[PDB]
Amino acid sequence: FQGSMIDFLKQLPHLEPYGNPFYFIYLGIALLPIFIGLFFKKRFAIYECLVSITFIVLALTGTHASQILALLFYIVWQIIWVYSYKRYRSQRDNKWVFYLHSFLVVLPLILVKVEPTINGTQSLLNFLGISYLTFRAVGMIIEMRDGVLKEFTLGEFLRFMLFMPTFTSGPIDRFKRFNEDYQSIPNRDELLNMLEQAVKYIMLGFLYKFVLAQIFGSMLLPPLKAQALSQGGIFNLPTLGVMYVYGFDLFFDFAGYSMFALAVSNLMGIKSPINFDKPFISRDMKEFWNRWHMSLSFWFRDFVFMRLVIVLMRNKVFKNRNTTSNVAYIINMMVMGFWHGITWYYIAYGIFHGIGLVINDAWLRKKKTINKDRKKAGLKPLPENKWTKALGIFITFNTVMLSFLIFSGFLNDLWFTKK
Amino acid sequence: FQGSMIDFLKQLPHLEPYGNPFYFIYLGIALLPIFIGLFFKKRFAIYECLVSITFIVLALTGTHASQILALLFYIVWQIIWVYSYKRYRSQRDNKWVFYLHSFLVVLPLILVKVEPTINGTQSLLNFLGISYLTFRAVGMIIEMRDGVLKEFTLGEFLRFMLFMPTFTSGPIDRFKRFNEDYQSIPNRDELLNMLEQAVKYIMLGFLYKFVLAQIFGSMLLPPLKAQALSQGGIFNLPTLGVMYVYGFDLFFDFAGYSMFALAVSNLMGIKSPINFDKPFISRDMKEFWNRWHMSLSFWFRDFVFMRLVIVLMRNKVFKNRNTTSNVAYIINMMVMGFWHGITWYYIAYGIFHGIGLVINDAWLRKKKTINKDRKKAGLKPLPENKWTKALGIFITFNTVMLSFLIFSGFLNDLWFTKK
Amino acid sequence: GSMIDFLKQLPHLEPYGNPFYFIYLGIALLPIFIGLFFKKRFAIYECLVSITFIVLALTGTHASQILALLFYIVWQIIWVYSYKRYRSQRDNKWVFYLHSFLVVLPLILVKVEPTINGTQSLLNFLGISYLTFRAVGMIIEMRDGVLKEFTLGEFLRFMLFMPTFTSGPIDRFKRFNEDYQSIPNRDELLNMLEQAVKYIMLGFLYKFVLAQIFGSMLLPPLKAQALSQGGIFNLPTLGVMYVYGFDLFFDFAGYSMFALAVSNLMGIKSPINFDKPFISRDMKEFWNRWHMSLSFWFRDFVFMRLVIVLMRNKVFKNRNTTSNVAYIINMMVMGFWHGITWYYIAYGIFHGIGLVINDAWLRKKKTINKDRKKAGLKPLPENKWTKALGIFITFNTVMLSFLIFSGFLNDLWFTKK
Amino acid sequence: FQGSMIDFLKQLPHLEPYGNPFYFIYLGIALLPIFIGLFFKKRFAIYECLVSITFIVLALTGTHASQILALLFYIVWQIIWVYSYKRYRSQRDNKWVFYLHSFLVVLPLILVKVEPTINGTQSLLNFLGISYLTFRAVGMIIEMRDGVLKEFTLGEFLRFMLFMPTFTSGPIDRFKRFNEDYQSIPNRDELLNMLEQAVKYIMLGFLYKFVLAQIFGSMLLPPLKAQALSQGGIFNLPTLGVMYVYGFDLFFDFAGYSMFALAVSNLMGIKSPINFDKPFISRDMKEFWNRWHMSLSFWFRDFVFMRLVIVLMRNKVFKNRNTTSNVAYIINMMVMGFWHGITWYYIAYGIFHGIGLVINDAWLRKKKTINKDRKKAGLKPLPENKWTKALGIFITFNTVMLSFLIFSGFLNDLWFTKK
């Protein structure tokens, strides 16, 4: 019973997901039949299960091919703890059973995030897309608590959780929407619109990830980091340069990936949620989070923020609504900080964005009451000309870039602050 | 530039039939046109012949490239002795002429299976698929003898015998079914169903041959063989491990090949006979042989067993039907053992399966008699609960695995008897 | 490391330099033409392809001109939109002049910098000479009110048109926009594709065969012989004059046919540059055939406006004197547009005096023909000999003008430069 | 001038026609618009000229790039001497003017064939496909003499004489048939049939030229030539082997080229004359020349043989028809040998085939009169069965292979000279 299985895995091809442009040749041909079927309102179940698995495995057979075994564990784990809840949801419905099942479904993510904190080495049950997979898994469990979801076969569950395009780090979806958009193949005109948008997304992804992302990440970021470290100190102008360059590099690389993922999803007939919709023209933090990482932000708003507000109002822990809203903002953003990894700078990012949202809500209330004061006194309301818009965009852009510097992790390198 | 023809043949590319997964890329592309042409009612004869010859030659080259010549001679031999009988078939059917023609059709296989035993290593005319091509040749001399075949062209004959997806060691076929199947191209929906089933077969063959066959073949079997040899003796627990692991490895590897062959055959518009339909769950040995290697077992039942029973009843040599059935069982299984190869363990395998079949038949007769005895005595008949079925399945599974241990030739290493 | 050296590292593809460039262009522009067949336009794909090929054409040995292109784009956007906001209110007849001057300012700086110190200014790049003409066009089309509303997409799609850009035919905004909006039907698209293939073939013949023969086989040795023999005039001077004239035509017409072909592959029929110029009977009929786009641009926006301005102030006594002065000034402005050297200005003034002499000769011929018809004498016949004489004299004068424009007289002589 | 243009012509890209399988990717992508336009009943006159000129130039820009200049002369020659007849044909029809114009049109071929005899070096006017273009450019004059041809534009003349596929060494056509097939674009069903036949021809051309021609020409022919030269003498077994191998190599290489040319022609909507139609089952010399090099043989039969027979019968030079037929056979085959080139072995080939045809006609007459003699005497007519047909096949095959040995020029090496 020799254990050379790991070395067997570290031999397969390693076609990187959305790596070289030539990838979109292979994938394109691999997606040529499926799309054709949609034109005849015919869906090939087995062929999709073949292409999705082949490309997932090709994406996961890298230097750390062992993660495949972890994946083959993870899936099984979810099948154990989703279906279990379904059985329970047929008969009884208690808060503590739902909480336990949510915790047990999200436990692999908790282990992957916490193990480096304790051991210092990556956990065994960690693979490429786990952070963006439990979101689907636990998502389904939440839908069973509300009663929205009642029946689903294993084929639907596994084709939803393991969606090929949005697997590595892609838009976070929901089961209800994905299933409803999977059942009803769009008519020919909508399918043609989807094909045109997919080609446009592929071209823009080429531009974003292979040109602008490369310029901002492999040409300016390393020398800027080196100069900032060499000058040293608490802060310096090269740190401002690296902050802005990293913000733009992060945005362009992630937008390129998201455009690729949405294009490949459209080629399969499913419209995955968008990720970025002009995030930098946002003139406010609350308007920013409706532009930046749309899928993740909306997921945390629907399932972690709204539910917490409902829980807090159920027990009326806080008297006024504003205090409860601020507390929910802080807790939601802190949980979003943990999700990235339990280090010092991710928690700082979460607390910083939570404080930003609370400050923005307070300023909205103060602006409203100041407008009331000026209107009652007969004076004109506060200006809303181009200058106020420019000031708001400038403040939002600066705060967002500060957040992307803190999230960058460069603040460890600049000053070795352990905690 | 050439030297000897054998060296030039060795220089040619070698593609193991269903070896690395990339093989299915080649075939896929090579079968991309033909299958599309199947949707309409047209077939590309030249393209099919060229691709079939290409892949047969690629599978035949390598270290044993000289066998290609052994193929060509073989083909001519069949064309000499099939067509000859055709002419004779139009005049009269004398039994001895039919026997002579069948013998001369199977003569290359007789030489291949009898040459290494006498003094040599391998006969010259031996090549890769001769074991599973004689069945497609002597399957015509019989069909003419019964008159179900009267007219056919050389194109049909050499397109049926040299079927590319079923050449090396594949599902044995019959001429009448194959020809009548290739004449009538299926409809559009049937073709889509066949494509979906072909993709399912490809995936399941991947699992059966590149994972499970690898696990049971090169991970457990060599260490278990080493432990069994080191412990020595008549038998040991490592020998039992070898038995079970080799049986599962044989089933998984062969079912992987057979699913690959059925998939590639479906991609060319022909549904080749299925080899395995859930073995290891057979209650009886008689039910086992309707599930394990279905194509060959059915071939021997139709053309070796039933004909033997008909011959024995024609001369009424034996007193009753039961004796004829038992003798036919023994002789048919001995002929199967001979077909595998003239060694002590193959003949032991054939005799073992024959004794199993006759004992199963005797047990069925005795059970029917005792059920009649209980019915006439008023007692409730013998139980048929889940426990009895489980016991029957367990007994059949153990007997089959013992037969596969004998067929493995491992007992030759473990005992060195009859060396 | 990212510097100007990074820009210089980028691949370089001289526009219409080798046939493989046309293979690249055909492969790139096939989807656009196929989409045009179905009356649909791929806005993002066209922009990406145009930017790609502009960058490839600009990333030469001196690839530091891309920064100049970006600065020029920003400058033109700023001033065009500054006028657009201002035009809707009122036109002061001097703010229009200021905006036109500030739109031609990069070009005038580029054409005046090498004269002053030693070299061209920083903001010089490849197509700046044939891009200003587009920008000023818009300003003109705002002063007369024929243009009122347009978006930044239309403006930057018209100005940075990839097929022409470098030296291609000069377009106008009104015609270009009305042509871009209305995709032609399928039969006209097929006719345009066939004409594009014909243009590609004829451009091959003109630029890669005839231009090579007249520029690499005869011109260098003829120049060497002319320099060796020396003197004001010589037979090698005639050789270099004729060879350079034919080289200029067979190279520029080849480039313009390439540009029209590539433009037709994107659904727009750019103005034709040459319509068989060497058969022009008169000097005035030569400019309707030689560099048609530029000559028509100067006639419409520099000549006619100058005549209208002079007439509305009635500075001169009669119409013919105004026409002569407008001819001379327009051709001098054309020479200046080419570059501030002695021979370019000599070329401009030469063409101006040629046009005015042609006009005077036509008027004198009309008067003398009227007198002869009054006297009963038959007018001078023109069947094959007079027309041949006119064609020959116009061809000789044009070839002399191209000798002057060549700058070869700068090498042959050493006049004050 | 400088005169370096030839060196310029040598730096152009080179692409041997039908040299590599990758060449057909370029050819198919270039010819796709023409085929689509055919499907819509449209011909793009300019685009066809562009693709034809580009591929002619790519075929002619080899080490002998200077031949392009010769080609540019050849066209300018032929035009001058085609229209010089077209103007004359309308006015007067003296025989000697037609003879003079035909001679002047064929003069470049005469110079290319004669100058190596005198000077010993290839002539300036020689280029790749002059021998298969003079045929078209003299066929137009021959048609014009008969009055079959009338007003024709220069576009038709130059698109006929310079056909892109059948240019280097391709099927020899006629103007009337080519023009009539150019005007009437086939229907959609005929276009589909042409596409199928073009793909079949391309595949068979791959097989014939890149596999079988390579086997017979680059692996067996050099060793057989070396052995035959080493043994020496008038005749030897290696020389017989080289005779048969060269015959098969010539047939396979030429048939591969002809299938390629017919395929590319079908992709343009024009079906050029076939070149080979089962040559080796001829059973006779006449049935061979009606099967071997169909285009060239039919051209020489229509314009050089029939015309000479008509001339001889016009002046009744010989007493009987058989003598005139034999003389015409000999003269036609001598002119064919001359067309191949003025050496000893080409003229020997021509006179050998002429004698073969004459004795075949004598054999037919003698067989007919012997059959008449036997019928008059009441005896059974001479047999015509499998054995007689096999004897005829054997005799014709041996004579044809001897002819291809003489045409090979190998007899010049082995027999004459020294080595």
Ligand SMILES: CCCCCCCCCCCCCCCCCC(=O)O[C@@H](COC(=O)CCCCCCCCCCCCCCC)COP(=O)(O)OC[C@H](O)CO
């Ligand atoms: C009434 C009495 C007089 C009648 C005369 C009838 C015949 C007159 C024919 C005169 C025109 C012949 C034009 C071509 C002759 C030479 C062609 C030849 O030999 O073939 C060369 C080219 O190959 C061809 O033959 C190409 C095909 C053309 C065949 C002839 C076409 C014209 C036929 C016209 C027949 C007209 C009959 C009368 C009609 C009323 C091969 O090159 P070479 O180097 O071997 O040339 C020969 C060598 O130099 C010895 O001089």
Ligand SMILES: CCCCCCCCCCCCO[C@@H]1O[C@H](CO)[C@@H](O[C@H]2O[C@H](CO)[C@@H](O)[C@H](O)[C@H]2O)[C@H](O)[C@H]1O
């Ligand atoms: C369902 C139909 C379609 C299925 C997919 C069809 C396409 C499949 C392509 C598989 C091969 C991809 O080919 C790709 O080649 C690249 C570049 O050479 C190689 O690249 C890889 O090499 C090895 C793994 O082999 C890794 O250590 C390396 O880091 C990685 O770059 C791999 O060999 C393979 O990742």
Ligand SMILES: CCCCCCCCCCCCO[C@@H]1O[C@H](CO)[C@@H](O[C@H]2O[C@H](CO)[C@@H](O)[C@H](O)[C@H]2O)[C@H](O)[C@H]1O
């Ligand atoms: C230390 C923690 C981080 C500090 C974070 C600082 C960022 C705080 C939020 C950004 C500043 C918001 O401050 C100001 O808000 C007002 C009031 O909505 C915005 O004003 C706008 O608000 C909304 C748009 O969403 C509209 O309804 C309104 O009409 C418009 O005026 C201004 O554009 C912005 O300048």
Ligand SMILES: CCCCCCCCCCCCO[C@@H]1O[C@H](CO)[C@@H](O[C@H]2O[C@H](CO)[C@@H](O)[C@H](O)[C@H]2O)[C@H](O)[C@H]1O
């Ligand atoms: C490496 C092994 C090489 C051995 C194989 C050699 C290739 C096999 C040769 C096939 C024989 C070719 O000869 C064949 O003759 C038969 C007899 O009519 C005809 O064959 C035809 O048979 C039937 C008749 O309807 C058709 O359905 C079929 O599609 C067609 O092939 C053709 O004429 C020709 O295809």
Ligand SMILES: CCCCCCCCCCCCO[C@@H]1O[C@H](CO)[C@@H](O[C@H]2O[C@H](CO)[C@@H](O)[C@H](O)[C@H]2O)[C@H](O)[C@H]1O
């Ligand atoms: C030494 C080599 C030989 C060893 C193997 C011998 C054969 C192995 C099987 C022996 C019998 C086991 O089979 C056991 O009995 C019979 C045989 O069909 C089955 O039962 C059978 O008999 C009765 C009716 O006749 C019904 O129950 C049923 O319709 C039928 O299948 C049992 O459900 C099965 O459990």
Ligand SMILES: CCCCCCCCCCCCO[C@@H]1O[C@H](CO)[C@@H](O[C@H]2O[C@H](CO)[C@@H](O)[C@H](O)[C@H]2O)[C@H](O)[C@H]1O
């Ligand atoms: C979405 C885009 C679709 C458009 C299709 C793709 C167009 C862009 C890719 C083409 C890039 C060509 O890339 C360029 O090719 C030229 C062609 O000689 C070569 O260029 C190199 O050699 C040439 C001449 O030999 C020199 O003049 C040049 O300075 C040097 O860089 C290089 O290979 C590369 O610089």
Ligand SMILES: CCCCCCCCCCCCO[C@@H]1O[C@H](CO)[C@@H](O[C@H]2O[C@H](CO)[C@@H](O)[C@H](O)[C@H]2O)[C@H](O)[C@H]1O
């Ligand atoms: C090499 C240097 C290149 C410099 C940059 C060149 C590109 C500059 C940006 C081009 C786009 C600017 O145009 C801005 O974008 C949007 C989104 O497309 C345009 O939107 C629209 O533009 C035009 C206007 O009808 C439409 O034809 C087009 O289909 C649509 O995109 C807006 O009109 C404008 O707000």
Ligand SMILES: CCCCCCCCCCCCO[C@@H]1O[C@H](CO)[C@@H](O[C@H]2O[C@H](CO)[C@@H](O)[C@H](O)[C@H]2O)[C@H](O)[C@H]1O
């Ligand atoms: C740089 C110095 C100037 C260079 C030369 C510039 C002038 C060159 C052209 C001068 C001649 C004008 O060219 C002249 O054009 C007119 C009108 O088009 C033609 O035709 C005219 O004259 C002919 C003479 O029979 C008559 O038909 C009629 O009077 C009129 O049509 C003349 O045949 C041609 O000679």
Ligand SMILES: CCCCCCCCCCCCO[C@@H]1O[C@H](CO)[C@@H](O[C@H]2O[C@H](CO)[C@@H](O)[C@H](O)[C@H]2O)[C@H](O)[C@H]1O
């Ligand atoms: C509308 C017209 C469409 C035209 C389609 C495209 C035509 C152009 C084809 C590509 C240009 C020629 O591409 C050709 O490629 C071959 C590939 O060996 C190379 O050419 C080669 O020719 C010969 C044999 O082939 C070699 O011995 C030689 O060393 C090399 O020059 C060059 O790279 C180029 O001559």
Ligand SMILES: CCCCCCCCCCCCO[C@@H]1O[C@H](CO)[C@@H](O[C@H]2O[C@H](CO)[C@@H](O)[C@H](O)[C@H]2O)[C@H](O)[C@H]1O
């Ligand atoms: C230097 C001379 C080179 C030429 C060499 C000979 C070339 C071959 C031509 C000779 C004829 C061969 O082809 C000949 O055809 C005739 C009539 O068709 C047939 O002739 C034969 O069969 C016929 C029946 O048909 C019988 O009368 C008899 O057995 C015999 O004459 C044979 O098929 C073959 O003998």
